[PDB]
């Protein structure tokens, strides 16, 4: 009969996995999981939400069977988990500034400027590596107080730029008075995959089959354009 699959995801990732004003869990990853459910009659996907910092521990302990949170591969992760074969998205990162700031064309125009970012994020590493390989022209600052810290600093001028993805900038503009924009070329564009507990290989393969079906009939493209835009 139908096998129940527990999906671990979040509620604080705008456009990916979040709660909208209506009050329901939605976003690209959540909607894709629901689409897969429709495509897989022998499976039933249920959700289990939690802080991002508990997703992988939960997956390893098999509290969830799959994790959906725009996850990327890494050496460490591949040793402890399984990744399906079909990437379902790319994660473009670009220098991001205050909408009315016209002094910055890209990462190369930051000599003497201050860039704010999240100490944990992959964007933080991207910035660091580039800054290190180019004579450290700018200062990297990390946020720590509370939310909206990056936007507030961009607004005041305390920060000249940050690094973000286009879909995050779109959400910022739709929900805040502080407007932002991306400038320059894509600095990083990592592939995104679902992650699995080591015991779920059959499930991962079945999901890859469904994803090919979703890609082939244009459903994935439709979903990415709706939630992420065309930069994906």
């Amino acid at each position: 009969k139908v096998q129940t699959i527990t999906v671990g995801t979040g509620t604080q990732f705008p456009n990916i996995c979040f709660i909208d004003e209506k009050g329901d869990l939605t976003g690209y990853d959540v909607e894709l999981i629901k689409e897969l459910d429709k495509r897989l009659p022998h499976y039933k996907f249920t959700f289990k939400t939690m802080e991002f910092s508990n997703l992988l521990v939960s997956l390893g302990q098999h509290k969830v069977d799959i994790v959906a949170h725009q996850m990327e591969k890494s050496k460490e992760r591949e040793k402890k988990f399984l990744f399906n074969k079909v990437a379902y998205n790319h994660f473009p990162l670009k220098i991001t500034v205050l909408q009315n700031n016209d002094t910055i064309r890209g990462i190369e125009d930051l000599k003497g400027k201050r860039v704010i970012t999240s100490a944990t994020s992959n964007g933080a590493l991207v910035l660091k590596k580039w800054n290190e390989d180019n004579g450290r022209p700018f200062e990297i600052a990390y946020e720590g107080q509370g939310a909206n810290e990056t936007a507030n600093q961009l607004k005041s001028g305390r920060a000249d730029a940050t690094i973000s993805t286009p879909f995050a900038v779109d959400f910022q503009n739709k929900t805040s008075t502080i407007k932002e924009k991306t400038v320059g070329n894509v600095l990083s564009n990592a592939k995104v995959y679902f992650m699995f507990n080591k015991n779920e290989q059959t499930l991962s393969d079945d999901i890859d089959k469904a994803l090919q079906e979703i890609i082939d009939d244009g459903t994935l493209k439709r979903l990415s354009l709706k939630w992420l835009g065309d930069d994906y």
Side-chain angles (χ1 to χ4, degrees), residues 179-192:
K179 315 297 179 177
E180 303 173 352
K181 67 178 177 191
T182 58
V183 294
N185 187 52
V186 172
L187 303 170
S188 181
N189 195 44
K191 291 174 180 181
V192 167

Side-chain angles (χ1 to χ4, degrees), residues 78-232:
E78 299 193 69
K79 298 184 299 178
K80 301 177 172 298
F81 305 106
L82 310 178
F83 287 83
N84 62 306
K85 293 179 143 298
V86 181
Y88 66 92
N89 191 37
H90 276 80
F91 208 76
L93 294 176
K94 293 184 177 182
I95 293 300
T96 296
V97 298
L98 196 60
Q99 179 163 275
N100 80 314
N101 189 340
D102 295 327
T103 69
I104 300 167
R105 298 171 303 169
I107 195 166
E108 298 71 21
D109 290 4
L110 298 172
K111 185 72 169 57
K113 294 185 168 186
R114 181 164 177 289
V115 187
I116 180 75
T117 186
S118 173
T120 62
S121 69
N122 289 305
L125 299 174
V126 171
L127 287 174
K128 190 178 182 64
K129 184 174 181 58
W130 194 92
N131 205 40
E132 274 168 36
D133 301 336
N134 292 278
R136 303 173 72 272
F138 58 79
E139 168 188 46
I140 296 179
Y142 306 99
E143 49 172 48
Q145 301 294 64
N148 300 176
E149 193 177 309
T150 289
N152 296 323
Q153 284 189 43
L154 287 174
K155 178 172 174 292
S156 73
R158 173 54 172 163
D160 295 276
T162 182
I163 183 164
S164 178
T165 199
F167 71 73
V169 167
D170 189 68
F171 185 89
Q172 170 63 26
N173 292 172
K174 187 173 76 285
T175 61
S176 172
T177 63
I178 301 170
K179 315 297 179 177
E180 303 173 352
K181 67 178 177 191
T182 58
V183 294
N185 187 52
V186 172
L187 303 170
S188 181
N189 195 44
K191 291 174 180 181
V192 167
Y193 297 84
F194 288 113
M195 289 182 71
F196 303 78
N197 170 282
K198 287 287 186 178
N199 301 295
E200 299 295 328
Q201 187 67 59
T202 297
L203 170 63
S204 181
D205 299 343
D206 292 335
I207 278 177
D208 277 329
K209 182 186 167 191
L211 284 169
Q212 193 63 63
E213 281 161 31
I214 295 173
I215 287 169
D216 292 352
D217 68 10
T219 299
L220 192 64
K221 179 181 171 62
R222 186 182 74 213
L223 202 60
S224 61
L225 290 175
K226 172 178 168 59
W227 292 104
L228 319 169
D230 83 323
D231 287 307
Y232 306 69

